[model samples]
Target: AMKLISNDLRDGDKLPHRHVFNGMGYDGDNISPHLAWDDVPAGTKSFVVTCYDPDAPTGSGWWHWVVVNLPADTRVLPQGFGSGLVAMPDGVLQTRTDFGKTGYDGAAPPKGETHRYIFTVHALDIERIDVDEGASGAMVGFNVHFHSLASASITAMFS
Candidate 1:
């Protein structure tokens, strides 16, 4: 079975600790939640992780994060994992998203409205998806659907 963990979180973790959510939707500390995992099924060779906000103003929702081709042994990603051209373990690549950017974007839910931010992890049976760096969210999703062995998701709502 595929399971997801984080250096700073665990299954059933309640995110947006005081260090993250500052009570103001736009005033949060802007830290990407740490993510890690274990018990990846045998024969699993790569991974995909994404963060999406289904409550965003857009009809289709917002994709805030997408990462692919992580080596199976690579289990954890620190806060702000892709916020910059920061060095990452070899083989990991970031994909584009609704923000038109190439990395993780923090939740900035509109004032007065609740936003549900979802973190999803997929354990893939493939070594890599046939996708280029900066590929759009839809492309990543398509590849993950076909390649994923098992997946996990976590949701947090902020108003």
Candidate 2:
């Protein structure tokens, strides 16, 4: 199996407030975390990174961050790479999130409920997905898995 690593959040651990969203009547830091992975499949030509919340009040769940077309040469996305506050990587594309914007929006669950944020990394056989920023996170996610050579994830909790 492939592996995913993040210095900010441990698997099966509580999410640090630094990556929590500041909206929905709450105030959190909302910064994107540092992520890196290795032991990729031999044919992987690209990578797609996603953050999803399955415990949202909505029936179909929530898509918080969807990044596409990351070059295969990429082995690490430095801390805050998706914040748009840092330099954007070459040949990378970010799709819309459930927050109604693009890039990393962070975890913002309902106050009384607990939520799990699943961060996934997909290694793809194709160099890129043929879509624009207009594509929904779900749409880009579909294509990400459709061409995936291998994938892995780590889950963190927030309440």
Candidate 3:
């Protein structure tokens, strides 16, 4: 029964200005979207959230954000929750994104090519996944993939 929803962005929609990367010569505000979930499975004890872009020029794709150990009873993550300018839940830990920095690193695809950013929420059976704070997204994802009980996603496009 796991389901994920976002207040700041909708599935298959274009990303808004506030959700685009504003650093490194980019013109947008690099914010994390507001996300919520409901009807998680009974035994779920924690969660993992991530944003990935499969259409990036990097041969292996890109991971924009990765958060782990969100409490099971937790629901909404407000917009800009971890943009390095706001606070997130107490126990949650954010891993390094493809940008090589921690927290959410919003969309900044090539100018002429549109990219789809997938924001996924994973409902997990364990209380936490074992990983360091600066762990890469792929490393966190490996643990997430093995420990997830259920997962859902919302995608937004950008250019």
lDDT of model number 2: 0.86
Q: Write the per-residue lDDT of candidate 3 for residues 61-80, one digit (tens) a residue.
A: 99998889999888878888
Lowest lDDT 10-residue stretch of candidate 3: 81-90
Model 1: per-residue lDDT, tens digit, 1-159? Answer: 656666654444444652233444466665677776777777788989898888787888898889889888767777778665358778788888787877776776766676777888888999988887779888998888888888877676664
Measured by TM-score, how close is model 3 to the native structure?
0.94
Screening candidate 3 with a backbone cut-off below 3 angstroms (N, C-alpha, C), the clashing residue pairs are none
Model 3 CA deviation exceeding 4 Å by range: none
Candidate 1 at 102: error in angstroms?
A: 1.0
Q: Write the per-residue lDDT of candidate 2 for residues 89-143, one digit (tens) a residue.
A: 7778888888788888778777777899999999999998998887888888789
Task: Tell me the lDDT of model 1 at 115.
Answer: 71
Candidate 2: worst 10 consecutive residues by lDDT? 79-88
Tell me each candidate's TM-score: 0.85, 0.95, 0.94
Which of the predicted structures, 1 or 3, would earn the higher lDDT when compared with the native?
Answer: 3
Q: Which candidate number has the best TM-score?
A: 2
Q: List the residue pairs that clash in candidate 1.
A: 5-36
Error of 3 at 75 (Å): 0.8
